[PDB]
Design an enzyme around this catalytic site. Structure first.
Site, short mmCIF file in Angstrom:
data_model
loop_
_atom_site.label_atom_id
_atom_site.label_comp_id
_atom_site.label_asym_id
_atom_site.label_seq_id
_atom_site.Cartn_x
_atom_site.Cartn_y
_atom_site.Cartn_z
N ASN A 85 13.54 111.68 15.86
CA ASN A 85 14.61 111.31 14.95
C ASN A 85 15.90 111.95 15.44
O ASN A 85 16.15 113.11 15.12
CB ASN A 85 14.28 111.79 13.52
CG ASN A 85 15.23 111.21 12.46
OD1 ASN A 85 16.29 110.69 12.78
ND2 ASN A 85 14.84 111.30 11.21
N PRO A 86 16.72 111.21 16.21
CA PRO A 86 17.98 111.76 16.74
C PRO A 86 18.97 112.07 15.63
O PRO A 86 18.81 111.58 14.52
CB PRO A 86 18.52 110.62 17.62
CG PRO A 86 17.94 109.38 17.02
CD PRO A 86 16.55 109.80 16.59
N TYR A 88 22.20 111.41 13.48
CA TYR A 88 23.05 110.26 13.23
C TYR A 88 24.42 110.80 12.90
O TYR A 88 24.54 111.81 12.18
CB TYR A 88 22.56 109.41 12.04
CG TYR A 88 21.08 109.09 11.94
CD1 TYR A 88 20.53 108.74 10.71
CD2 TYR A 88 20.25 109.10 13.06
CE1 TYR A 88 19.18 108.43 10.59
CE2 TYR A 88 18.89 108.80 12.94
CZ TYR A 88 18.37 108.47 11.71
OH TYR A 88 17.04 108.17 11.56
N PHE A 176 14.45 107.90 3.55
CA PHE A 176 14.81 109.31 3.53
C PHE A 176 15.30 109.67 2.14
O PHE A 176 16.31 109.14 1.69
CB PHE A 176 15.91 109.61 4.56
CG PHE A 176 15.46 109.52 5.98
CD1 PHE A 176 14.87 110.62 6.61
CD2 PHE A 176 15.62 108.34 6.70
CE1 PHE A 176 14.45 110.53 7.93
CE2 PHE A 176 15.21 108.25 8.02
CZ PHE A 176 14.62 109.35 8.64
N1 LIG Z 1 15.47 115.61 14.83
C1 LIG Z 1 15.88 115.96 13.44
C2 LIG Z 1 17.32 115.55 13.13
S1 LIG Z 1 18.42 115.65 14.57
C3 LIG Z 1 18.96 117.31 14.06
C4 LIG Z 1 18.56 118.37 15.08
O1 LIG Z 1 18.98 117.99 16.37
C5 LIG Z 1 19.75 119.00 16.98
N2 LIG Z 1 20.79 118.38 17.82
C6 LIG Z 1 21.98 117.80 17.43
N3 LIG Z 1 22.61 117.36 18.54
C7 LIG Z 1 21.85 117.64 19.63
C8 LIG Z 1 22.02 117.40 20.99
N4 LIG Z 1 23.10 116.78 21.45
N5 LIG Z 1 21.05 117.82 21.87
C9 LIG Z 1 19.91 118.46 21.42
N6 LIG Z 1 19.75 118.68 20.06
C10 LIG Z 1 20.70 118.28 19.18
C11 LIG Z 1 20.29 119.85 15.85
O2 LIG Z 1 20.49 121.18 16.27
C12 LIG Z 1 19.17 119.74 14.82
O3 LIG Z 1 18.16 120.70 15.06
#
Ligand SMILES: NCCSC[C@H]1O[C@@H](n2cnc3c(N)ncnc32)[C@H](O)[C@@H]1O
EC number: 2.1.1.72
Length: 393
Positions: A85-86, A88, A176
DNA sequence: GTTCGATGTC
DNA sequence: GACACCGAAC
């Protein structure tokens, strides 16, 4: 953010990798997807997680943890499976947008990503990055907003995906808790071609995917839930956009800068209209929702077309078609403005009643469900109109 | 010249 | 749970 267990379990059921295969979770934090896939499919893979925040990164020892911005990350080898889940969000100034990075980093993103378009979104970048990091035949399983199915910001992303392999989209909707986002799952495989669109039904434990439609020749066209009803309507009618030049209203700052615009009601001042002034079949000319007033006869200085009565269609009332004929020709700060093409002549009352029809409301809700909280230009220009319903050439 | 919103407001 | 951004961004 936490991905609900049933969402995770569904995605894991769609996840496949060869034994010994490299399995990556981007933006992993503690790595719920890596944990879940291991639970389900066993221990014989190489598990990897990338996390930018050293405080967030907390993978089990059986997984490699990487401290990196995933979007700028250049590993040695590609991956067999990428799931997660990237984040958003639009990267922009904190007063308006939720993602805040140093300008140079955003510059690096635009530079790295062929699909980056307009304001774009962190999730589009994560999607393209995931595909570029995938081995041929490799599988991607992401949960993302639905907005990319239809929005113009993601037109390059859809083209990219369509040329890079085969795509399955699974609509989930608002899954969600206490969070307003209509979600889909994308299962992309870096081989073959075509799009499969799936509905889902919720089970006690996960989701049951139901195939809606197939587009083996998909080249990145907007993604919609088409039926026989929506197809007949479209083929029988003329698209609105062949009949009209479609413009949007002048924006807030354009009125702000205008030397005759006031913050207060008064002598010879008419309200600058917003989406709240637009109603099904009529316009509220009285109430002010903009905080701005100006002389009606100076409106045309913002937009030429404010000088003449014309069709106004709503943009932010959800996936609906709310239309009115502005017979008074007021200044608008919002909404679509549709001006007849040369040779097109209108019957405003018939057209307005047609556009506001329940038949039309059904048509757009069928096609676009709740992907976005708008009626977009892409949707509006495709609304079918017959001549009896208020146009002639 | 107009887009977009892991939201805000009620 | 209905109905709206509004202005930074390109
Ligand atoms: N996968 C759950 C939601 S995405 C939120 C998480 O992704 C991380 N995150 C946000 N941008 C990121 C990036 N560009 N590369 C790696 N992790 C990232 C944040 O630190 C947080 O732990």
């Amino acid at each position: 953010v936490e991905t609900p267990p049933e969402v995770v379990d569904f995605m894991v059921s769609l996840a496949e990798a060869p034994r010994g295969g490299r399995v990556l979770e981007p933006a992993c934090a503690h790595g719920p997807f890596l944990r879940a896939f291991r639970e389900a499919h066993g221990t014989a893979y190489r598990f990897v997680g990338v996390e930018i925040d050293p405080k967030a990164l907390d993978l089990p020892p059986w997984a490699e943890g990487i401290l990196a911005d995933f979007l700028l990350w250049e590993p040695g080898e590609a991956f067999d499976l990428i799931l997660g889940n990237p984040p958003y969000g639009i990267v922009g100034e904190a007063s308006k947008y939720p993602i805040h990075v140093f300008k140079a980093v955003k510059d690096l993103y635009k530079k790295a990503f062929s699909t980056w378009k307009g304001k774009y979104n962190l999730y589009g970048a994560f999607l393209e990055k995931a595909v570029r990091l995938l081995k041929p035949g490799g599988v991607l399983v992401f949960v993302v907003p639905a907005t990319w199915l239809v929005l113009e910001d993601f037109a390059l992303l859809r083209e990219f995906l369509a040329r890079e392999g085969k795509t399955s989209v699974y609509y989930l909707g608002e899954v969600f808790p206490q969070k307003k986002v209509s979600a889909v799952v994308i299962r992309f495989q870096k081989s073959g071609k075509g799009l499969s669109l799936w509905d889902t039904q919720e089970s006690e434990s996960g989701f049951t995917p139901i195939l809606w439609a197939e587009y083996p020749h998909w080249e990145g066209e907007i993604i919609r839930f088409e039926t026989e009803e929506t197809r007949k309507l479209e083929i029988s009618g003329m698209p609105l956009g062949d009949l009209f030049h479609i413009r949007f209203a002048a924006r807030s700052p354009e009125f702000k800068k205008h030397p005759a615009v006031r913050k207060e009601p008064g002598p010879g001042l008419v309200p600058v209209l917003t989406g709240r002034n637009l109603k099904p079949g009529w316009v509220d000319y009285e109430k002010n929702h903009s905080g701005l007033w100006m002389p009606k006869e100076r409106a045309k200085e913002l937009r030429d077309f404010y000088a003449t009565p014309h069709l106004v269609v709503a943009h932010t009332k959800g996936t609906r078609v709310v239309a009115a004929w502005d017979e008074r020709a007021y200044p608008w700060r919002e909404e679509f403005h549709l001006l007849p093409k040369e040779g097109v002549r209108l019957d405003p009352s018939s057209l307005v009643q047609w556009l506001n029809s329940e038949a039309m409301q059904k048509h757009v809700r069928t096609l676009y469900r709740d992907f976005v909280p708008h009626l977009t230009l892409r949707m509006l220009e495709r609304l079918p109109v017959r001549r009896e319903y208020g146009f002639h050439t």
